[PDB]
């Protein structure tokens, strides 16, 4: 399934998706997106 | 370790107390499950 983990490297509030995604790519995930409410950066990968 | 989270595929209704979410999540072959703190979703957890 699609598994998520908060990014270990992304700092600040998650406004834009692209920075979050880039952080998540750098830590071997497939994507990254901002979370629903708290605007955390979630990295996603098939699991 | 690197905990990964995925919303339960079988848990229905809102998630308040851990045990039923944890049961469904183990039943989906995850390691554990817990209620999310804002949206009260049942999130399954496994090492990823
Ligand atoms: Cl249930």
Q: Which two tokens stand for residue B45?
A: 């957890």
A31-34: strand order across its sheet: A31-34, A41-46, A2-6, B3-7, B42-47, B32-35
| Structural determination approach | X-ray
Domain boundaries, chain A: 1-47
Cβ neighbors of A11 (< 8 A, separation 6 or more) are none
CB neighbours of residue B36 within 10 Å: 16
Is B40 near chain A, with CB under 8 Å?
no
Q: Could you tell me if B45 and B10 are in contact, meaning their C-beta atoms sit under 8 angstroms apart?
A: no
Compute, in angstroms, the gap from residue B5 CA to the centroid of ligand 1: 17
Q: Which of B3, B5, B39 sits opposite A37 (nearest CB)?
A: B39
Distance, in Å, from the CA atom of B18 to the CA atom of B23, rounded to the nearest integer, reads 9
- Interface touch A5/B48, C-beta < 8 Å: yes
φ, ψ for residue B47, nearest 5 deg: -65, 135
Q: Resolution to 1 decimal, in Å? A: 2.3
């Amino acid at each position: 399934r699609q598994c998520k983990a908060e990014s270990n490297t992304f700092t600040g509030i998650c406004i834009a998706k692209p920075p979050c995604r880039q952080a998540c790519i750098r830590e071997k995930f497939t994507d990254g997106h901002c979370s629903k409410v708290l605007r955390r950066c979630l990295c996603t990968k098939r699991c």
